[model samples]
Target chain A: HCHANEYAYAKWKLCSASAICFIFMVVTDAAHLLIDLTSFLLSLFSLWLSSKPPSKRLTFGWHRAEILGALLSILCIWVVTGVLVYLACERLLYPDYQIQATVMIIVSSCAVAANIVLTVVLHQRANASVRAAFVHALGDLFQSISVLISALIIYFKPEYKIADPICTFIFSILVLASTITILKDFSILLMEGVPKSLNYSGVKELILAVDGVLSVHSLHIWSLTMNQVILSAHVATAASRDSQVVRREIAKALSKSFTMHSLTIQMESPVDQDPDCLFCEDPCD
Target chain B: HCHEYAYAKWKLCSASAICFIFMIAEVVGGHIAGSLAVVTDAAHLLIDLTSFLLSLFSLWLSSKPPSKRLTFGWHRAEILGALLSILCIWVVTGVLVYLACERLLYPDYQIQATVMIIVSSCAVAANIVLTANASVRAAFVHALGDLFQSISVLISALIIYFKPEYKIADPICTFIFSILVLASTITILKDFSILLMEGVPKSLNYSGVKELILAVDGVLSVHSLHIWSLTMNQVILSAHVATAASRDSQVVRREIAKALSKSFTMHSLTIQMESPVDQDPDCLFCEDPCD
Candidate 1:
C-alpha cells in the first residue's frame, strides 16, 4: 500500500508534465499529445481508485481497477492514433497548412526532455498500470524525437513537408507496438484468464506430486491483480490417508514454488463416490 | 442450457426486429409530423434496438463453454455489453437533450399532430406487448421506458392537435422522455459496474456468510472467504476451513455445503478443509481473526 503512494506521486508528476506539454502540442496541433494527456489522466484515476481498501460489498478490494484503467488507456491511445493516422494521410494528399517549424522544434525538444526525465522517474515501479505509463513515456520520447527531426527538416527545406506526416505514421506505429503487450496482459486479466507468470500444467503437476494424493480435478488458476495469483482445486486423495495431511503437504509444496495470494484445495477421499462438482466438467479438461 | 439459450436468443431477436421496424416508423412519422417529441421517442427506440441487438450478441458469446483461455466462460461479456449499452444510450440521450433544449428556446416549426397521434398510438400498442414479454431485466426496463415514452408522445400530440397554441408541449415532452431514458438505465449501470469490479452481490451478506460457515459442526475456523458473481445469476465462492483432525472431513464438508445451499444458491462452491494442528501459520491469504 505504501508503494501505491509512491506510484501515485510519480503519476502526478507525469500528469503535470503531460498537461504542460499538452498546451504546447495544442498550439502546434500535434495529435499525440491528446493521447498522452488522456492516458496520464486515466492512469492517475485508476491508480487512485485501485488503491481503495476492501469493503463488505467489494471483498477483493479495487485491485482490478488498475487493470480496467490500463485497458481503457490503451484503447484510447489506439483510437487517437488511428484518427491521427487518418488525418496524416489526408494531410499528405492535401498539404494546405503551413508547418510552424520554430514552434514545432521548441515544443518537440521540450517534450523529448520531459519524456526522458519522466521515464527515468517511472523505471523502478513494476506494476502493469505503472508499466503502461512508463511505456507511454518511452513511446512519447521516441515520438518527440521524430517530431523534432521532422520539424528540423521542414525548417531547412520547406518543400520536404511530407516528412511531417510520414513521421506521424512511423511514430504512431511505434506507440501501438509499445503498448500491445500491456493491452494483451490487461485484457487477459479482465477476462479472468490465468496470469501469464504461472503455468497451469506445472501447478497441476506440483499438486499431483503430493504423496497420498490420487488426482486433481477442477483446478482453477487466476489472478486478483497483477501481483496476486489465486488457485483453487479439488484434490482427490487416498482413502486411508488423512485428507488434512494431504492438503497440508500439497499446500506446502505449492507455497515453495509459487507466490499464490490465495490457495483453496478441496480434499476428497476415495470413499466419496460423487464425481460431480462445480467445474469438474471444465472444457479444458 | 441449450434450450434456455435458444429461447433467450429468439426472444431478443424478435424484440430487436420489432423495435427496428418501430423506430423506422417513428422516424418516418416524426419527419412527416414535424414533431420533436416523436423524433425523440424514435431516438429512444433506436437505443433500445441497439441494446437488444448487443444483448443478443453477448448472449450468444456467453453461451460458449469455458475453455483454457476463459475459465469462467464468457459470462462477463454480457455484463460488459450491458455497460456498453448504457453508455451508448447515455451519449445519444445527451445529444437529444441538447436538441430538445434548442427546440424549447426556438419554437417556430409547425407539427402535424394527427400524424404524430396515429404513429405514437401504434408505438404505444407495440411497446405494451414488448414490455409484457420482456424476460431479461435490462430489456424489460428498457421496454417499460419505451412504453412510457410512447404514451408521453401520444399525449403531447393530442395536446397539440386540440389546442394548436400549446406548441411548447412537444419539446417539453421530449425533454422529460430523454431524462426518463437516462433514468431507466441507472440501476443496470450500477449493478453491472459492481459485477465488473468483482464486488459481492447486494443480496449476500459477507459477515453472515462467514458466521454461517463458522456455525457448522467441527469447524474450528474459516479464512480466505470470497464470494463473487460471474454474472447476475451465477455466484461463486471459495473459502478455507480449519477443523479438528478427529472430525470426518467429508461430513463437515457436506454439512457446510448443505447449510450454505439451504440459504443461498451458489453456482460454484469450493471449501478447503484443514486440520487446525496442521494449518499453516504463514498462510498468506487468510483474513485474520476470522469474523
Candidate 2:
C-alpha cells in the first residue's frame, strides 16, 4: 500500500510536468510532444483506477486496468503518429513551412531535462505499471533531444527547413518502436498466456517431482498482473496415498520453485478420474 | 453444431448480400443526386454490411478448440469483434457529424430530391426486411439503426422537394440520424467493456453464487471464488472449498457441479477441495476480502 502511494505520487508529478511541456509544445507546434503528454495522462489515469482494492465483483482487482491503459495509450500514440507522418510528408512536398526555431530549441531543451529526471526517478521501481511509465519518459527524452537538434539545425541553416519534418519522422518512429514491447506484453496478458518468467515444462516437472504425485493434467498458468501468477491443475495420485498430503506437498514444491499468487490443485485417484474431463492427459492435453 | 446454426447463417448471408448490393447502389445514387444525406445513409449501410460480415467471421472463430496456448479458446474473439464493430461505427458517425455541421451553415440547394426519394425508399424497404430476419442482437441493432436512418432521409428528401426553403432539412436529418446511430450502440459498448474488464456478469448475483456453493452438503467454506465469461453465453468459474474430513471430496465436488449446472450453464468449472486441518493459515490467495 505504501508502494502504491509512492507510485501514485511519482505519476502525478510526471503528469504535471508533461502538462507544462505539452502547453509549450502546442504553442511551438510540435506534434510529438502531444503524443508524449497523452500517454503520460493515460498512465496516470490507469494507475489511479487500478490501485483500488479487489472487490466481490472484481475478484482479481483492477490490475487489468493498467494493461488496458497501456494498450489504449499505445493505440492513440500510433494514430497521432500516423497523422503527424502524413502532415510531415505534405509539408515536405510543399517545403514552404516556417517555424520559430529559438523558441522550439528553448522548450525542447527544458523538455529533455525534465524527461531525463523523470526517467531516472522511475527506473528504480520494478513494478510493471511504473516500468511502463518509465518507458514513456525514456521515449519522451529521445523525442525531445531530436526536437532540440532539429531546432538547432533550423536556427543555424534557415534555408534547410526540411529538417523539422525529418525530425518528426525520426521521433514518430521512436514513439512507435518504444510502444511495441508494451503492446506485446499486454497482448499476452490479455490472451492469458503463461508469463515469460516461468517455463511451462519446468513447472510441470516440479509438480511431478512431488512425492506420491503420479501425473498432472489440465495444467493452466497465467498472470493476474505482472507480479502475480495464477495456476490450476489436476494431480493424480496412487489410491493408497493420502490425497491431502500429496496435494500439500505438490503445493509446497511448486510455490518454492516459483512465485505464485494462487494455486488450485484438484486431487484425483486414477480409478476415479472423471471420465468427462476432456483435457485430461498424461501431462496435459 | 454446424447444423444447429445453418438457418441463422443463411439468414445472415442473405441479409449481408442484400446490404452489399444496396450499399453500392446508394453510393452511386447519392453521388448522382448530389445529396449529402443520401451519402451519409450510404455510409450507414456500409457499416451494417461490415457488422454482418464480422459477425459471421467471429461466429466461426468462436468455434475453434481450446489449445495449450489459448486455454480459453477463441470465444473472446466475438466480444472483440463486437467492440471493433461499435468503434468503427463511432468513427463513421463522427465524420458524418462533422460534415453535417459544415453543411448546416451552407445549405446545398441542388440536391436531386426525386433521386434521393427513390433510392432511400428502396433502402427503407430493404432494411425492413433485413430487420425482420436479424437472428442476433448485434445484427438486429444495426439493421434497426439503418432502418431509422433510411426513414429520416426519406422524410428529409420529401420536405426538400415540397419546399425549396427546407434545403437545410437534409443536413439536419443527417446530424440527427448520426446521433441516433451513436446512441443505439451504447448498450453494446457497456456490455463489452464489462466483459473485457473481467467484471461479473450483470445477471449473476455474486452473493447468490457463494450461497449456492455453501449450501452443498459437507462443504465447510469457500474462498477465491471467481466467475467470468468466455463469451456472452459461455460462463466459467473456479473456487477453493474446505470440506468436512469425513465427507468424500468427490461426492461434494459432484453435488456442487450438479447444483451449479442446474441453474447456470458453465463452460468450464474447477472446484479444489481441501481439508480444514491442512488449510494453510498464510495462504495469500485465500480469504478473499469480498467474501
Candidate 3:
C-alpha cells in the first residue's frame, strides 16, 4: 500500500514533467527527515531525563522513550509533507521558474557520496529493517544520476530551459513512490500484520503433511527481534503416532526453512476436537 | 564481539574518528543543500560515534578480566558497544537518507553547489583510509557506503564546476548518499537483532542438541526444551525430560551437562523430569523416545 504511493509519485514525475509537482518529492523527503530529527532530539532529551533517577513527572523512567520517538516522527513527517505539498501547489499556479541543472548535478553527486559514506557507517549491522531503510538511500542514487543527466542536457541546450524543472518534477515523483513504500511497510510493522515473507498457507499444509496429523489452524507469529521470529499453532493429529513426534517434526521444519527458532504447538486428538467442533471452521469430512 | 572491540582497538585513530570526520563533512554539504535533516542527522551520528569511542575506552578501563568481587566476568563490554554503535549508527543513517532522497527527488529550491561538493570530498578521503585500517569485516561493511558518499560529492563537484545550469546537483547528490546510508544501517542492525533473539547460534546444530538430550539412558521424552546464548561460545539449556522419575535430579543434570558438552558447546543446563500425569488426559502417552 505504501509502495503504491511512491509508485504514484514516481510516475507523476516521469509522466507529467511538471516543475511544481517536484515539490511533492521535496515534501516527502522533508517529512521523512523532520520526523527523524524530531524523534532523535526527543529521544536524546528523554534519555537525559531518564538518567536523573525517578522524578515526580515520570515513574517508569521513560521505558517508552523509543516508541515515543517513532510515533512522534511519523506524525511530524506526515504533517511536514502535507504542508510542503500545499506550498508547492501554490507555486505551480504561477509559472515563474528556471532550473540550473549543472549546479544540481554537482551537488547531487556530493549527496551521493555522503550517502555512500553514511551507508558504509551502517554496513555492519545488516538486517531487513536497516536494509529497508537503505533502499531509500540506494534509490536516491538513481535519482541523482537522472538529475545529473538532466543538468547536462540543460547546460548544453540552453534553449530547452524547462528541462530543469521537468527533471525536478520527475525526481519528486520518484520520492513519492519511495515514500509510499516506507509508509506501507511501517504500517504493516505497527499493525503486526503477518510478516510478508511468511507463508501461512504453506505452513498449515506442511503441518498437515506430517503423518498422523489431520489438520492445523490458529497459527500465530511474533517478532522478538527483527529476525527472531516465534510461532505457535494448533495441530489436530490422529492416534497413528505419539503427538510428540509431530511436535518435533513441525519444529524442525519451521527452524530449517524459516530461520525461526522458538515454537509452541498445541496438539489435539480426534477426541479433544469433538468438544470444540462447533467453533471449528474446518471442512468436516 | 569484533564490532564491539573495533572502537577500542581503533579508538580516535580509527573508524570512530572517521565517522566523525565524514559526519562533519556531511553537515557542511547539508548546509549548502539547505537540508536541515541531513545536518541534524550528521550531528547525531557525530555525537553517537564519539560516545561509542568513549564507551570502548571505558570497557577496557572498567573491566578487562574478572576480579574476586565480580565473578561472572565483564564479557558484555564489547558486545554492548557493538550493539549500541549499530543502533546509534542506524538511527542517524535513517534520518540522513530519508531526507536526502526527499531533497533530491523534488528539489523545489536551488542550493549552493560549490560548497556542498568540494567540502564533502574531505570526508570521503578520511573514510577511505579509516575503512582500510579497520578490520577486513568492517571495511566490507562501511567502505562501499563511504565510496558512494564520495562519489556523490565528486559528481556534485564536476557538475558545479563544469555545468552550473543544473543547480540541483547538491540535493541530487544528497539523495544518492541517503540511499547508501540506509543500506549500511540495515546491515549492522540485522546482526544485532539476531544476537538479541537468543536463537540458535549459526554454528550450533539443532539436530545435535536434540540427539544429545534424547540419548540419555532411562529418559523417555524431552519437551519444553530451549537452548540459547548467555554470550558468544557460551550456551544455556532448559528442558523437561521424561525419565524413569527414579533417578535423582543431580545425576540427571550432570548427565545432561556431560552429553550436551560432548555433543554441543553447552556448559550450563537445567533439566526437569516428571512422571507422566495420570489425571491429565491430554498427555500423549509415550513409552520411549522412539514412540
Candidate 4:
C-alpha cells in the first residue's frame, strides 16, 4: 500500500525519530536501531535506482546497485543470525521460559501455508529484490515447519520443555551453514576478482607463449560488474618488432576466450634492460 | 609472543567460539518464537562462513615467498581483501536502509520481548569483546552491536511490550546505524585508496626525498624518482641518479640507499647511476615516456 511518496515520508519520520533517539540518549539500542532503519532504506533505494536509466554522471548505469542490494540483504541476514544465536543460548541456559504448544502449532501451520504461497508467487518475478524476498519467505516456510514440529513434541510430552529451543537452535545452525556460500560469492564480486569463467593464469600463459611477447608485468584483470571485464597490463617485446601488430595479436588472443574482451596495453621495450646495469654490484666505478 | 598476531588470533578464536555456542540457542529460540529474523541470520551464517574462507585465501596468498612471476609476492592480495571488507559495509548500509524503511511503513511485528532483550544484550557483550581486536574486522562486529542494527532488537522489545505507540523506534534506529556505517566505511576507503593506488606514502615529502638524495656527495641530480608501498609495512622506491665522473658511483649509490632507508623508512630501492659526461642531453630518452 505504500506509494513512493508514502515510503519517502515514512522514512523521513523514522530518520528524525532515530536522530532524536541517538541525540537524547547515547544508548546502544538507539544507535543500533538507527542503522537498522537506514539499512532498509538503502536497499529500497538500490532497487529504485536500478529502474532508472543511466544518468550522465553515472555512465555505467545503476547495475552495481543490484549487487549492492544483494550484498546488503545478505548482511542483514548475518546480523539476524547473530541475534538468533544469542537468543537461542539465553533460552537454552535459562529454563524460565516455556512455550504453549497448542496455539503455537496452529498459528505456525497457517504461517507455513501463507509463506509457501508467497514463495511461489515471488519465484515467478524477474526482479532481484522480490526474488530475494521469496528466498527469505521460503526460508520462513522451513522455519515454520520446525516450529510446528517443536510445538507438537512439547504438546505430547510436556516434560521436554527444552525441545522448542533445541529445534530453533538446530535450525539456526542450518541457516548459518547455508549463508556462508552466498556471502563468499558476493565478496568475490566486491573484490573485483576475476570471473570464474575467465582464467588469469592460463591467459597469462597463452600471452607468454606468444612468439613475440617476452615478459609481462603490471597486468590487471578485473570486472566492473559480472558482465563487464577489463584488462590493462604492460608487455615487454623485442625492439625491432612491430609493436602495433603485437598489440593487435594480443588483443585478438584475449578476446577469443576471456570474459574481458576490452584490452588496454602499455608497451615497454625488452632491449631497454641494460645488460651492464649501473645499479648492479659490478666494477662500474 | 607477537602482540598483534596474538591479539588477532585470540579475537578470532574467542569470537568464533561464542558464535558457535550461541548458534545452538539461536536455532532453539527461533523455533519457539517462529522468528523469521533468526532463520534469515542462520542462512547468512553460511555467508559468514564464505567470507572467512575468502579471507583465508588472501591470508594464504600474502604469506607466500616471492618468485620470478610474482616479483612482489602476493602483497596485493591483502589489499584486495581489505578493499573487499571495506566495501562489504556498503552492503551493510544498503540492507539496513531497506529494512528500516520497511519497518516504518509497516509497523506490525510480534516477538518474544524479554527473551529478545536478554539475547540482544549478550550480543552487545559479544561484539564489544570482538571489537577489542582493533583491526579492520574488529570495527565490523562493533558496528553490528551497538552501532548499526542490534539496538533495534532492544528497542523493538521495549516498544512491543511496554509502549506500542513508540514502535516507530525500530525503523529510526536502523536509519541511524546505517549512517554510522556510511561514515566509518568512507573514512576507511579514503585511507586505503591511496595504499591501493600505489601512491607515495604521506609520511615522506617528495621534495624532501629529492633533497635527501641530492645531499649525498658526488650526486649531481636525480630524476624519475618513484615511491610507493607494496603493503602497509613495506615501502619500495626507485630512482635514476646522476653522478660526477671522478666520484665512485658505487659509494654514491650505497650512501643514497642508506640515507633513504634510515631516515625515510624506505625498505627497497633500485638506483640507476648515470655519469654526467655520457648521459643523454637533458636526459632526453627519460622524457620519452615509452617505458
> Judged by DockQ, which candidate is best?
1
Candidate 3 local lDDT, A96-141, one digit each (tens)? 6565556666766664564454344434422333333344444444
Q: Model 1, stretches more than 4 Å misplaced?
A: A1-35, A75-109, A112-125, A135-181, A274-279, B1-11, B24-39, B93-144, B151-178, B278-285, B288-291
C-alpha RMSD by candidate, in order? 5.5, 4.7, 20.2, 16.0
Query: Model 3, residue B249: what's the lDDT?
Result: 38
Estimate, for each residue in A1-285, the C-alpha lDDT of model 4 and write its tens digit. 000433243343324433432342213212332333344345456556655553212323455556656665666666665665676688777767644676767766565665565346445523334444445545545566756787786688778766766777777667666666655654454444555555667667878878878876555555544556656555668877765567667767766654452345545557344443322211111
Model number with the top TM-score: 2
> In candidate 4, how many clashes are counted?
51
Candidate 2, residues B226-250: lDDT per residue as tens digits?
7777567677677888867788786
Q: For candidate 4, what is the DockQ?
A: 0.02
TM-score of model number 2: 0.83
Give lDDT tens digits, candidate 3, residues B4-58.
5655476554756766666766776666464432353364356457665756565
The candidates, ranked best first by lDDT, are 1, 2, 4, 3
1 versus 2: better lDDT goes to: 1
RMSD of 1: 5.5
Residue B19 miss distance in model 4 (angstroms) = 24
Give the residue spans of candidate 4 off by over 4 A.
A1-44, A47-69, A118-138, A205-212, A238-241, A272-285, B1-291
lDDT score, candidate 3, position A70: 40
RMSD of 3: 20.2
